[PDB]
Amino acid sequence: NPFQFYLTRVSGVKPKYNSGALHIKDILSPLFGTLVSSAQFNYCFDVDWLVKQYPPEFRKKPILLVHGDKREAKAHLHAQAKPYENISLCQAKLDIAFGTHHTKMMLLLYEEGLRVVIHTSNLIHADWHQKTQGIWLSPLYPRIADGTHKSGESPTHFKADLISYLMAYNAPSLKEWIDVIHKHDLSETNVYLIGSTPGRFQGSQKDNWGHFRLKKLLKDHASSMPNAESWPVVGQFSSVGSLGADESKWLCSEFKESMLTLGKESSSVPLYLIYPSVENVRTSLEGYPAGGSLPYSIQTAEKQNWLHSYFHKWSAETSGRSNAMPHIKTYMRPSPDFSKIAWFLVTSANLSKAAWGALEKNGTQLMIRSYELGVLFLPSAFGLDSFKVKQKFFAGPMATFPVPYDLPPELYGSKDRPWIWNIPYVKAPDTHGNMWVP
Numbered sequence: 001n002p003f004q005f006y007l008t009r010v011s012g013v014k015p016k017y018n019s020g021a022l023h024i025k026d027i028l029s030p031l032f033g034t035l036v037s038s039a040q041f042n043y044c045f046d047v048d049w050l051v052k053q054y055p056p057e058f059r060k061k062p063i064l065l066v067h068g069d070k071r072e073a074k075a076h077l078h079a080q081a082k083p084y085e086n087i088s089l090c091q092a093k094l095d096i097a098f099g100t101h102h103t104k105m106m107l108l109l110y111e112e113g114l115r116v117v118i119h120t121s122n123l124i125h126a127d128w129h130q131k132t133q134g135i136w137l138s139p140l141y142p143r144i145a146d147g148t149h150k151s152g153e154s155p156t157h158f159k160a161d162l163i164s165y166l167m168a169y170n171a172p173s174l175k176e177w178i179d180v181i182h183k184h185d186l187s188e189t190n191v192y193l194i195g196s197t198p199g200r201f202q203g204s205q206k207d208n209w210g211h212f213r214l215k216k217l218l219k220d221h222a223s224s225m226p227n228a229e230s231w232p233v234v235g236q237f238s239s240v241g242s243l244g245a246d247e248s249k250w251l252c253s254e255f256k257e258s259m260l261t262l263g264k265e266s267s268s269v270p271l272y273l274i275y276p277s278v279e280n281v282r283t284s285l286e287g288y289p290a291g292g293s294l295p296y297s298i299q300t301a302e303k304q305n306w307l308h309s310y311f312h313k314w315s316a317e318t319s320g321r322s323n324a325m326p327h328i329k330t331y332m333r334p335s336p337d338f339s340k341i342a343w344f345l346v347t348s349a350n351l352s353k354a355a356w357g358a359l360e361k362n363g364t365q366l367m368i369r370s371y372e373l374g375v376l377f378l379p380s381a382f383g384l385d386s387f388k389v390k391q392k393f394f395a396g397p398m399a400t401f402p403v404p405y406d407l408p409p410e411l412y413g414s415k416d417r418p419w420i421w422n423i424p425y426v427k428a429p430d431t432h433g434n435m436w437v438p
């Protein structure tokens, strides 16, 4: 397989569903390289747990935690890290209201080279225990010889784009990592970076981030096919923002319009949204506590009941993960019979204006509140016209893409309700015998 897309290990499924999965201990293992220094970009951190995931011989190597916490949350994080002399912190600036630092990324500097990991898990025990999470593993990037002048750039522009993303933080600790990346050869990378950074982007910068970045990539590096209007759009996420009073406000006006783009030329495209139902959560491996990581509030949901008619249950027999609640977020473009896909994106971005951006100032400015990061798999980057969908995620011409959940997606039944985390569920107990009383 050339894609290097993995799921995290799930405690409680049979070994056959964990064979090709990765735990954080595997990612940080000496088998992957001899660690010199690392940066951990994330949202939530359990520092005691995190240090224990590094191999004993690597636990005093420098670690940088890149986070978005302010005030008391910021002090708690500093207090967590203070016992560890080798840990530095970098507070990502969040100058727009209600923004968050959601990007999940590891920069791993070895003696042998550099690795980049873009993933979907927080750095806490429960995110790696019984959830469905995604990981993209870069190749080992070798150092460019001192005195040798080459770009080290890939056909997907990954090196320039990763540096651009880091430069947006305007942070001294990340300028060091930028200089590290400059010195390595990233030319083997076959994925495109899609990031969000907070700001108001106009003119040349409008295409740099969020759903306009996605649109630009699909315009330039994907091809439109006959009957493209029949190829659905699938979005799969663990949280929903306030999208407005009807679908025309954002979801189907600008978001879907970016996601529908294919090729350079100029809607009834079906849109499937996958989001766990209450029953999905109740019968999950974790039980109702899995809903602690699906933070859809009743306040938001009651303003957009129109949205729930797009919702499809979580189902993942293909990877043995129907009862491992999703914290991965994915977006893709399958064929009408779901046997191939025009592209696939794995990201930290949920279905929200905060993450993807919303147009302002008469359509001339893209406003983004949050930091997010994902990678886009395009067939053209692999010498292909489309990807065949892998029938079983862990089974087996290794040019078929491992989609981690079942297709086609199954619509909510009439008795189903979207998981809403701040209301009680006292009708039926979960897999541990408990109810949900927020």
Ligand SMILES: O=C(O)c1c[nH]c2c(Br)cccc2c1=O
Pocket (backbone or CB within 6 Å): 043, 102, 120, 121, 122, 292, 293, 294, 295, 348
């Ligand atoms: O980006 C992330 O990983 C997350 C961000 N916010 C969350 C909230 Br608010 C409540 C529960 C879980 C998460 C979460 O997982």
